[PDB]
Amino acid sequence: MVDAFLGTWKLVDSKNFDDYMKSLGVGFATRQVASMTKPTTIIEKNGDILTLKTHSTFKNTEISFKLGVEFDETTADDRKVKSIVTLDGGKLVHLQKWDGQETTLVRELIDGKLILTLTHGTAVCTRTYEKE
Ligand SMILES: CN(CCC(=O)O)c1ccc([N+](=O)[O-])c2nonc12
């Protein structure tokens, strides 16, 4: 199940992140900085509680959750959302809902790399992380 996702990951490729942020309404100055930032994502577990940290020189976030149990979240761009994370087809699928809108954050493992696919509206972004 989740164990192969655990650890420290560093961003090594990003496609269409500006399009995704624009779709969400993120302002230009935040997008400019975020486009050059290379976050570290740390995924830890304690029993069935997962913690996902995203660290950078700009934004820092942390969420803790049980798989399959909804939780409140405030995103890096300050959306207040209702979230759930689950394991679907071997992928870690994070769904965020607010104001009747949705976005998905899907994490898969491919050849040892962590591929994060972000979808909102028509915008589809792919970020690739490598394990530290
Ligand atoms: C979804 N992510 C996380 C990306 C990742 O973890 O690589 C985001 C990370 C950072 C910002 N931001 O506005 O600074 C975001 N705005 O929308 N999404 C944002």
Side-chain angles (χ1 to χ4, degrees), residues 2-132:
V2 80
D3 300 83
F5 291 100
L6 304 178
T8 301
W9 299 93
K10 327 287 274 177
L11 186 76
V12 300
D13 189 67
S14 185
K15 297 179 168 82
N16 300 342
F17 189 45
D18 180 73
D19 283 346
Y20 178 77
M21 289 187 287
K22 280 186 59 173
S23 185
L24 290 170
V26 180
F28 76 92
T30 292
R31 298 197 320 274
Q32 198 179 99
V33 178
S35 73
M36 295 289 295
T37 295
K38 295 184 183 182
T40 300
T41 300
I42 306 167
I43 311 179
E44 294 173 298
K45 81 178 185 178
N46 182 352
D48 66 342
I49 302 310
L50 273 73
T51 301
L52 192 156
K53 301 175 177 186
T54 309
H55 294 342
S56 80
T57 55
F58 181 37
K59 308 284 185 70
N60 294 273
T61 59
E62 180 174 315
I63 61 174
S64 292
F65 53 89
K66 288 177 176 181
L67 292 172
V69 176
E70 189 175 63
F71 59 104
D72 287 297
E73 175 183 9
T74 301
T75 68
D77 62 309
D78 308 309
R79 287 175 285 118
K80 296 184 171 187
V81 308
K82 309 277 174 190
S83 290
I84 191 170
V85 183
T86 189
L87 186 71
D88 177 354
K91 304 189 185 196
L92 186 71
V93 176
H94 182 183
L95 173 62
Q96 298 173 335
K97 296 174 192 176
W98 72 106
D99 296 335
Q101 296 178 244
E102 302 189 329
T103 186
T104 58
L105 304 89
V106 174
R107 290 177 173 89
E108 70 187 304
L109 299 165
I110 305 176
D111 291 332
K113 302 190 217 244
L114 178 63
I115 310 319
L116 170 62
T117 302
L118 304 167
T119 304
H120 176 249
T122 61
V124 184
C125 159
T126 312
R127 287 166 63 88
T128 304
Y129 283 82
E130 286 174 356
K131 186 95 95 62
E132 182 206 282

